[PDB]
Amino acid sequence: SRKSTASSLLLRQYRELTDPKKAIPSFHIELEDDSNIFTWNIGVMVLNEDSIYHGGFFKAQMRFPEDFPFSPPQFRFTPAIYHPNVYRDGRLCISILHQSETWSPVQTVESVLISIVSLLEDPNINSPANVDAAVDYRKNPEQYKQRVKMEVERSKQDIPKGFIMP
Ligand SMILES: [Zn+2]
Ligand SMILES: [Zn+2]
Ligand SMILES: [Zn+2]
Ligand SMILES: [Zn+2]
Incomplete structure (x- = not known):
């Protein structure tokens, strides 16, 4: 019910972020099991091109609450990456x-994803x-850079078969 409303709102945004003419090349979006909208x-x-992250394909999972957009999603890198704002388990x-700029119900999946790449x-x-x-x-910027470069290389192993990198 609240779950029903959330699922329709998420589907609208999913369609925007996966429609060939509305999709953002920075973000490749799929559903868990090709069917779980949450x-x-x-x-x-x-x-x-300037970024030490350029060329990577960093897999993540975004879990949405059943009262979306009245509560924030969670976002986890899978696997974790070495970054000041990423916990060791990938969160x-x-x-x-964060509830309650923190989360607000006018935020969208697109605005969150943009914030994450920023x-x-x-x-x-x-x-x-x-x-x-x-x-x-x-x-230790050179140490940091070399660790991220390793993870960029590791991440290319997750590029789905057939996928065309932008
Ligand atoms: Zn795909
Ligand atoms: Zn390039
Ligand atoms: Zn936090
Ligand atoms: Zn160290």
């Missing part, structure tokens, strides 16, 4: 997904989920 498997791409800590490139080192990565980011 759990999306997302491939995050960093199209900015992303980002202000737009945070990849510009981490919040003042509120770090991974203090090791936060320290490396500012004090």
